Structures are given as C-alpha cells and as structure tokens.
Design a protein around this ligand. Structure first.
Ligand SMILES: *[C@@H]1O[C@H](CO)[C@@H](O[C@@H]2O[C@H](CO)[C@@H](O)[C@H](O)[C@H]2NC(C)=O)[C@H](O)[C@H]1NC(C)=O
Ligand SMILES: *[C@@H]1O[C@H](CO)[C@@H](O)[C@H](O)[C@H]1NC(C)=O
Ligand SMILES: *[C@@H]1O[C@H](CO)[C@@H](O)[C@H](O)[C@H]1NC(C)=O
Ligand SMILES: *[C@@H]1O[C@H](CO)[C@@H](O)[C@H](O)[C@H]1NC(C)=O
Ligand SMILES: *[C@@H]1O[C@H](CO)[C@@H](O)[C@H](O)[C@H]1NC(C)=O
Lengths: 91, 54, 172, 172, 172
C-alpha cells in the first residue's frame, strides 16, 4: 500500500586518505596531490634561453678564458653552470 | 642535461611541471615555479567522505 | 560532517552509484530503481572544481634570487641568507599545511551539506505524504508508481492529490 | 550557503525590506503585512561588525627599515634586501587573499545560518498549527489575526489555544 | 553557534552533568533521571583532542641563527638583520592569531554541531510518538518507563509498538 524512497551518495571501492582540521586520516572518494615531488631530470630548452656552460664558469667566460672563447657575446635567460667547469688561464 | 621540450619551471634537478601549487624537488628555482615546501605529499580532497558498505 | 548526513544517518555510500554523487533509490510495487540527482552533484562539483585557484591564483614568476647553497664559509652574510631562506621555507610550509587542512575540512562539510540539502528538499516536497525513517530514507504512504517517483525526483511532486490517501494510511 | 536557506529554499530576497535583514511577510484575512526581526538582524550585524579587528587588531608601527629602492648595482647585499622584501610582500599578499576568502565564506555561511535559525525558531513555535510549504513560508491552519501574527513574531505564541482548530483543519 | 543548539534553543547548560558533555534528562511517572551520551561526547572529544598537532606537527629544531641583539651600530647589515627578524616575528604572530581564532570558531561550531546531531538523532528515533517542545526537550505521548527511556538513549527504540497510543494522545 506504500512506496519507499531512499536517499544516498556514491562510494568507491578504494579511497584516498586526506588530513583535515579534526582528523589525522579520513577517507574520501577522490583526492589530488598538491606537492610536486619528482622531476624528469632534464632541463627544457624552451621557453627560456638556456646557455649550457660546458667546462666554463660565468666569470671565466666573462674574462675570456681561451677554452671559453665560444661564449663570447652570448646571451641567456638562465646560465647553467656545470660542476665539471675549470679554469685553465692565469691564476 | 638540456633537452628539447617546453617547461616554465627549472630546478637544478631539471624542469618540473607547474600545475601543482607546491613542489618538494628543490628550493632553487627559476621561472613560473611552485612554492617549495618541506612536505613530500599533501592530498586535497576532491570528493565526499568515503563510506563503503559493510 | 557537521550535519550528520554523510557518515551520519545515511550510514552508507552506494558503490553502485556511478551516474552522480547524490541520488535516489526507490522501491515500490513496480520494482527497485535508482537514479542520480544531477543538480546537487553539479553544485558540489562546481564548489569543489576550483578551491585552490581562488587562494593561489597562479605560480609567481621568480628569476634572479639570492644564493641558497654555499661552498665555503663566509660568516654574517651567509648566515643571513640561510636564515632568510629557512624562514621563508618554514612560513610557506605552514601555509601549505594550514591551507590543505582548512580546504579538506570545508570540502567534507560542503559535501555533507549538499547531502543534507537534498534530503531537506525531498522532505519538504513530501509534506505530509511521507515519513522520515531515520536512515536517510522516506516511507511514502500512498501508491507512488514510477511517474510519482520521477515527479519527486523532478521537483514537480504534487502533495495535494495524494494527501487524503497518505493521511488515511498514516494516522488510520 | 551551507544550510540552503539563502539562495536555497527561500529562493528570493525582499527588496522592499529596509527595516532589517531578516523579517516576516504575512497574509491573512485582514490583509498583507510586513515586519523585520530585529533580534536575528542584530545577531548577524554583531557577528559581522568586527571580523577583521579580531585577526588584525591594528596597524603595526614601523619607523626605520631597510632600503627598498636602489640606484646603482652593489651585488650580494642588494640582492638579499630585494629577496627579503619580495618574500615579505608575497607572504603578506597570500595572507590577505586567504583571510579575505575565509572571512567571506564564513560571512555567507553566517548569514545563511541566521536565516535558518529564524526559520527553525518560527517552526518550533508553530508546533502543530502550521506546515512548512517548502519555500520558506508557513501555512498556518487557523484564524491568525494581526495579534496572532505579532505574537508569532514576538515569540509568545501559544500553540495550545489553536491546536484543536489547527488539527481539525489539517487532518480533517 | 551555527546551528542554534548551544546558546540557542537549548538555552542552558547543565552544571550537574559531569558524566559527559552531552546527555539526557528525563521525567516520567517513575521520576526524574539523568544520563550522559558517551558516543556524542567521544565524537566531540576526538575532534578536539588534536586540532593543533594537525597544523603544527612539532616544534622545528633551530640551532645556529643570525644575531638578534646588537651592542654597537654598524649600518646596512644590522638593519637588514633587524628587518628580517621583525618580519618573521610579525608574520608568525599573525599566523598564531589567525590560527587560534579559526580553531576556536570551528570548535564552537563543532560542539554546537554535535549537540544538534544528537537532537536530530533523538527526534528521528521518536518518529511520531514525540513532539519537539522548542526548548531542546521532547514531549513523548505515551507511557515511557525507565526501560523505554533507556531504549531511546540506547538507540533501539521501537516506535511501532507505541504508535497507536501516541497518535491517540496527540491528535485525540
Ligand atoms: C579524481 O579526480 C581526478 C582529477 O580530475 C581524476 O583524474 C583524471 O581522470 C581523467 C579520467 O577521464 C583523466 O583523463 C585525467 O588525466 C585525470 N587527471 C589526473 C591529474 O590524474 C580522477 O579520475 C578522479 N577519480 C575518480 C575516482 O573519479
Ligand atoms: C584499490 O582497491 C583494491 C581493491 O578494491 C585495493 O586492493 C587497492 O589497495 C586499492 N588501491 C590501489 C592503489 O590499487
Ligand atoms: C521534469 O520536469 C520538467 C519541467 O517541469 C518537464 O519538462 C519534464 O517533462 C519532467 N519529466 C522528466 C524530465 O522526466
Ligand atoms: C511582545 O512581548 C513583550 C514581552 O512578552 C510584551 O511586553 C509586548 O507587549 C509584546 N507585544 C508587542 C511588543 O507588540
Ligand atoms: C543497549 O543496546 C545493546 C545493543 O543493542 C544491548 O546489548 C543492551 O542490553 C542495551 N541496554 C543497555 C546497555 O542498558
């Protein structure tokens, strides 16, 4: 003689644990990571002008170290200075 | 190493995507980079509280 | 969980619900049926889709800064640089932690609020023809076929044409 | 909008209401009338009047600071000064943005809460003599003249002296 | 105080309540009795016990920093050190103030929410056998002895076995 109407909400078989003001760990249907913790390991050459300094430091390229002669009149947005860089001119 | 690709944010560890607001890769950054934090993970809830059956 | 709807009197999520976030399950003479409420689901999704661009609009663009790694030991200036960077890192880490906690708490309260709002709206449609059973489910006290149920879900339910039968069934 | 009262089941603001923020409109045999509820309006106004002095008590007083504009180029010290000032500016800009967003959200929830509280109080006064029509309006099931309506608004409504007539009208 | 339960329609705290935070007082034919609801009290206590470790996990460990007190007057470097320390102190003082205000507001809303949740749960158990008197107290319309009251408090109240008598008493 009667009908029944239930109200409910969706669930998921496995859920993500997040932290709130009142709970250290509470399970929710979905969650997004906000901290980027990994890198590709390579420097993209766009959109910034990247100047790879092979064996040269910025000061050595500035002064005009012979093995730095390829860096004359160079421009950069980011000068990438390598650990293998060394000086080979007057001390 | 340098690569042929597009990325706005460069760290000493390489280029990283800047879609996330925070990063834990390196405190040295260049470009449009996420803010550096000490936490390695921060989950933002994008759904309701999950109550499975049983 | 301020309203006690989700993880409250509802007591259970529906893993068979994939159409939306909030919806109805009905059992009547014809048989069991299920549907999703698009309006409440869309309200919750809209209130959740941003929620981080509204506080941190974009990544700030920084090009030339202080040095943050040092080979040798200078003294005052290196100490000041390290102190400045450490202070900035601590403050931003606290900001991130507090923001995430606040947003998660508000999102939980928000979804629970949408659930409670749907419940109250459905109750208000069923003025005297239904009774809350206390588990988030309404007992409707009249013949309510599929058209009746869809009218309830639609929002165009007409409580007047069933009021006599419903009152006769409830209060005998 | 956590309770679904404002921009919810109320569905509409009254531009003719200038006496207060929350109030009543009544239609009975005598005719239409309107009034404002001073207590709820005052509660909301009191909870809103400060709300910024409670977090930022006053302007801090700063007299001699670092230089923030430079003509020539020095190097380390100028870079450190620029970095410190930029870090401070970014942190305070984030603080301002987050504070404004949080306070606006709480103010909206607060006003919606006061509306819902007034609604629930009015419903509780009208124990069995009225029914919620679902649009924020009560159908009262007895002769309720202007004195009756003002008693409802006053808070001294006596549901017992109308209960017989109201039950007779509702359940027939 | 978003729900209007505490300092709302409840209107009064019970100083004789020491067993828990939330509870029941009942008056029937046998006599007055009082008990505490352990589940709601435990929910509120659990949501309050941390609430600061969830934002500030621990004290950060700092060993060697800049100098913050100076005997003589140097100039640029001392000014920069003072500016950095003052900026850090102001930002952390603001953080402390805002965090305390936010947590206090949420704690008040949380306890008020637990009170309202207990009230709604009790109302939903007493489907048609009781009426809300508007002061946080239910008038139950049937013989409800101590076993009946403890069943209400327990959660295993069976509204069906009293429904006839309760309807007969309410609607005459
Ligand atoms: C949780 O939300 C995320 C964010 O949208 C969803 O992840 C996306 O899912 C779609 C599926 O069509 C993919 O195309 C996207 O590439 C995903 N984005 C990311 C960043 O992973 C995810 O599906 C949601 N989870 C659930 C269970 O709904
Ligand atoms: C997903 O669900 C399965 C079972 O439903 C579970 O074993 C697993 O741990 C969950 N998470 C992932 C990441 O697979
Ligand atoms: C639902 O309501 C709309 C508008 O009142 C109507 O056009 C439609 O036919 C109804 N039924 C549905 C969508 O099944
Ligand atoms: C409203 O109530 C107060 C106190 O019960 C009473 O003094 C007053 O006469 C009532 N009517 C009004 C203010 O119109
Ligand atoms: C309360 O309910 C529980 C479980 O239904 C039952 O075991 C117990 O006897 C009841 N009465 C009490 C605890 O007085």
């Amino acid at each position: 003689s009667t009908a029944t109407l239930c109200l409910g909400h969706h669930a998921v078989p496995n859920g993500t644990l997040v932290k709130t003001i009142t709970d250290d760990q509470i399970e929710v249907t979905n969650a997004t990571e906000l901290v980027q913790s990994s890198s590709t390991g390579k420097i993209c050459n766009n959109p910034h002008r990247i100047l790879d300094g092979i064996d040269c430091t910025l000061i050595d390229a500035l002064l005009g170290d012979p093995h730095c002669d390829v860096f004359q009149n160079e421009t950069w947005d980011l000068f990438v200075e390598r650990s293998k860089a060394f000086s080979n001119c007057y001390p | 190493p340098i690569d042929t690709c597009i990325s706005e944010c460069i760290t000493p560890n390489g280029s990283i995507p800047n879609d996330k607001p925070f990063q834990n890769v390196n405190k040295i950054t260049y470009g449009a980079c996420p803010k550096y934090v000490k936490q390695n993970t921060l989950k933002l809830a994008t759904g309701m509280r999950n109550v499975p059956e049983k | 969980g301020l309203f006690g709807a989700i993880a409250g009197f509802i007591e259970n999520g529906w893993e068979g619900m994939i159409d939306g976030w909030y919806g109805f399950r009905h059992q009547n003479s014809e048989g069991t049926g299920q549907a999703a409420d698009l309006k409440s689901t869309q309200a919750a999704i809209d209130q959740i889709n941003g929620k981080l661009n509204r506080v941190i609009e974009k990544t700030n663009e920084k090009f030339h800064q202080i040095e943050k790694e040092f080979s040798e030991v200078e003294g005052r200036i290196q100490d000041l640089e390290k102190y400045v960077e450490d202070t900035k890192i601590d403050l931003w880490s606290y900001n991130a932690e507090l923001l995430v906690a606040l947003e998660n708490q508000h999102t939980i309260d928000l979804t629970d609020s949408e659930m409670n709002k749907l419940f109250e709206k459905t109750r208000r449609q069923l003025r005297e023809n239904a009774e809350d059973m206390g588990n988030g489910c309404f007992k409707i006290y009249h013949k309510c076929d599929n058209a009746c149920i869809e009218s309830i879900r639609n929002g165009t339910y007409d409580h007047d044409v069933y009021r006599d039968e419903a009152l006769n069934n409830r209060f005998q």
